[PDB]
Write an enzyme that holds these catalytic residues in place. Sequence first.
Site, mmCIF file in Angstrom:
data_model
loop_
_atom_site.group_PDB
_atom_site.id
_atom_site.type_symbol
_atom_site.label_atom_id
_atom_site.label_comp_id
_atom_site.label_asym_id
_atom_site.label_seq_id
_atom_site.Cartn_x
_atom_site.Cartn_y
_atom_site.Cartn_z
ATOM 1 N N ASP A 1 9.351 7.821 21.704
ATOM 2 C CA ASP A 1 10.761 8.040 22.003
ATOM 3 C C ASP A 1 11.655 7.129 21.170
ATOM 4 O O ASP A 1 12.776 7.518 20.820
ATOM 5 C CB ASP A 1 11.015 7.833 23.497
ATOM 6 C CG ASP A 1 12.370 8.358 23.941
ATOM 7 O OD1 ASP A 1 13.400 7.754 23.573
ATOM 8 O OD2 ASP A 1 12.404 9.379 24.659
ATOM 9 N N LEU B 1 0.806 -1.215 0.000
ATOM 10 C CA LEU B 1 0.000 0.000 0.000
ATOM 11 C C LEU B 1 0.841 1.267 0.000
ATOM 12 O O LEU B 1 0.577 2.187 -0.782
ATOM 13 C CB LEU B 1 -0.942 0.001 1.212
ATOM 14 C CG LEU B 1 -1.984 -1.119 1.237
ATOM 15 C CD1 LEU B 1 -2.913 -0.962 2.425
ATOM 16 C CD2 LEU B 1 -2.775 -1.149 -0.062
ATOM 17 N N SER C 1 -4.272 7.422 2.105
ATOM 18 C CA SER C 1 -4.068 8.668 2.825
ATOM 19 C C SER C 1 -4.339 9.857 1.909
ATOM 20 O O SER C 1 -4.299 9.753 0.681
ATOM 21 C CB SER C 1 -2.646 8.748 3.381
ATOM 22 O OG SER C 1 -1.709 9.017 2.351
ATOM 23 N N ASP D 1 1.146 14.228 15.424
ATOM 24 C CA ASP D 1 1.632 14.009 14.066
ATOM 25 C C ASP D 1 0.483 14.128 13.066
ATOM 26 O O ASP D 1 0.204 13.229 12.277
ATOM 27 C CB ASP D 1 2.328 12.652 13.968
ATOM 28 C CG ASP D 1 3.172 12.516 12.717
ATOM 29 O OD1 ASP D 1 3.548 13.555 12.134
ATOM 30 O OD2 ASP D 1 3.457 11.369 12.315
ATOM 31 N N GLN E 1 -1.628 10.677 -0.625
ATOM 32 C CA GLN E 1 -1.706 9.990 -1.908
ATOM 33 C C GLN E 1 -2.815 10.565 -2.779
ATOM 34 O O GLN E 1 -2.632 10.735 -3.990
ATOM 35 C CB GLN E 1 -1.919 8.492 -1.691
ATOM 36 C CG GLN E 1 -0.802 7.814 -0.912
ATOM 37 C CD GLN E 1 -0.998 6.315 -0.789
ATOM 38 O OE1 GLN E 1 -1.905 5.849 -0.097
ATOM 39 N NE2 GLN E 1 -0.146 5.550 -1.464
ATOM 40 N N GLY F 1 0.221 9.470 18.583
ATOM 41 C CA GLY F 1 1.032 9.044 19.705
ATOM 42 C C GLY F 1 0.228 8.453 20.841
ATOM 43 O O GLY F 1 -0.243 9.180 21.721
ATOM 44 N N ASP G 1 -2.150 6.888 13.229
ATOM 45 C CA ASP G 1 -0.729 7.109 13.508
ATOM 46 C C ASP G 1 -0.521 8.210 14.546
ATOM 47 O O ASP G 1 0.375 9.048 14.413
ATOM 48 C CB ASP G 1 0.050 7.427 12.226
ATOM 49 C CG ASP G 1 0.183 6.227 11.304
ATOM 50 O OD1 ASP G 1 -0.429 5.179 11.592
ATOM 51 O OD2 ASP G 1 0.906 6.335 10.290
#
Lengths: 273, 310
Positions: B176, B33, B109, B149, B112, B169, B167
Amino acid sequence: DWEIPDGQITVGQRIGSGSFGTVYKGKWHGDVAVKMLNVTAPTPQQLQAFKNEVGVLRKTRHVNILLFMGYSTKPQLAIVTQWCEGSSLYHHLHIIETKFEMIKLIDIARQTAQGMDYLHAKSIIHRDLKSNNIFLHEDLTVKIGDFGLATVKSRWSGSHQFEQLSGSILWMAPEVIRMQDKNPYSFQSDVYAFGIVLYELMTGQLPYSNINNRDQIIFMVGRGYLSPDLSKVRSNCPKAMKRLMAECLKKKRDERPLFPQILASIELLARSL
Amino acid sequence: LDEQQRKRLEAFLTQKQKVGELKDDDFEKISELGAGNGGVVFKVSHKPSGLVMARKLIHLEIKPAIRNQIIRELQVLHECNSPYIVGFYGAFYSDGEISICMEHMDGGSLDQVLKKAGRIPEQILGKVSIAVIKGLTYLREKHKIMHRDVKPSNILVNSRGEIKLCDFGVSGQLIDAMANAFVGTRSYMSPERLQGTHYSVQSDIWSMGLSLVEMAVGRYPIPPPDAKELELMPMAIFELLDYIVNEPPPKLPSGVFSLEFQDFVNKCLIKNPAERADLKQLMVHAFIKRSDAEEVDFAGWLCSTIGLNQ
Ligand SMILES: CNS(=O)(=O)Nc1nccc(Cc2c(C)c3ccc(Oc4ncccn4)cc3oc2=O)c1F
Ligand SMILES: Nc1ncnc2c1ncn2[C@@H]1O[C@H](COP(=O)(O)OP(=O)(O)NP(=O)(O)O)[C@@H](O)[C@H]1O
Ligand SMILES: Nc1ncnc2c1ncn2[C@@H]1O[C@H](COP(=O)(O)OP(=O)(O)NP(=O)(O)O)[C@@H](O)[C@H]1O
Ligand SMILES: [Mg+2]
Ligand SMILES: [Mg+2]
């Protein structure tokens, strides 16, 4: 012509990828390391500079230096170097957590500076010195790899290899981070990276352990706001060693000592112990 | 939470129950992908249940103590169940790689989709802004976690018109561990984060605004468009970071987009995180009140952009 043809390199298991290639364990009159470079379609101007650099990396034979066996261009452009057993220094310090004595730690720092002193004596800038590129052959001798190769790093336009910033940021000097010099990579940039490697040995940690933001490290280190916390040096480390580490980590590069002086320092506290 | 969303949410928990322990042998690789510098993602079929899921593979060189903690911390994703968060099937470790199994989004995404679209219409970015704001809200209230992010490659879409975040945190040890990565090419990092500890969800809002500008113009807006490049309607990584900190924030062109949209992104790109708008203010902004009332066909626009039938 240091080029290796096709059918001579039995490419085997995939090991992993780094800053500029992917490594496979190959066979070529013995076990070798085949790194498939990230520059798949080189320019004929890029190709001739790569062949020129292989010629210099070829004439380098030192005990603390991984043997450069040449290259190949048949399936894709690649690099063939010596395969070494055991784990890298990064695996020992940060994955396996191997417990060396203080004597063995200082000895690792000696052989590393010894090999680096040979590379600078032949006017070769490593540009990528880190514990990942330092292998402990048979848990005794240190072997430095992934040195030089400034032309296969930083892709070309058509004839203007602008030194571009790739690698691991924890070992990059501040002047390297900024890339505002266009020849930031120097002998003192490798010395700084050597200083971060000293921080690994003497603390058992990677620098900036309390910062978990990649771009925050890139900005603050390039701005001189961030520096490795030297408090983390363990209690049993020599004072003469902690001062040598701080000299390699100077923010301005002209203050950093060169390896003829660094190696002399290490061997001095190596004896008196 | 309307009826069509409660239907789809409950339908995901049903197929999720059909999946037990996740082993590497239970998967068959269908197709690749995408591949960033985080890892590589494959479309796979879970043979014990026939479910088609996305399998992200992160190869980290960390010690097993830190790694086993990452797998343990990732199990909080079983609690994240919102129509604006990508579904999570289960994470595990095998063959030196962490595998995070998440639901398949056949649209990909927005990074893309932006490539196949060139630019994205303001009417579409209005619906995307609503999902991101609702997605950040669910993470902020129901789990008290930031996203850290927000960028086009972390906003996922599918053929059923859904827009979800992913994606984010959730694992502090994974954050980290990723800090020892090679340098990227571009940054969506708010100026406060680049300089020292963030200002909570405010710092995610900056990234959303920077992502909106990039998708609206079809170009990474740092630095802002040069000469006649705007009427046509290789900076170093450190200089991009120094620009975000010590230069005025980017902005939309004055002639192409509505003033409600231009003001929306301008409130999101205020360099002071306290003067920046929060989720409460953006939720009732003019551009959002309007874009929420518009009946835009997002699912049809997506399949048209990729080249599939609707
Ligand atoms: C750039 N920001 S940073 O803070 O510097 N670094 C990080 N930022 C965010 C996050 C991370 C780390 C991280 C990643 C990469 C991740 C990827 C997939 C995943 O699975 C998943 N499944 C369903 C839905 C949503 N996710 C969970 C994840 O949890 C994490 O903590 C940073 F390392
Ligand atoms: N000559 C070698 N012999 C054996 N293993 C190697 C050799 N070179 C690299 N490796 C291993 O191959 C993997 C990837 O190495 P590499 O592509 O060099 O990335 P890296 O060293 O971590 N970063 P970089 O060297 O800057 O590209 C790691 O697990 C290394 O330990
Ligand atoms: N669940 C999914 N469904 C469809 N496509 C996906 C999915 N997850 C990831 N992708 C695609 O896979 C590509 C790489 O994902 P990823 O490994 O996270 O790198 P990235 O987020 O794009 N960039 P980086 O975060 O720096 O590694 C992206 O461009 C996505 O479009
Ligand atoms: Mg290496
Ligand atoms: Mg991503």
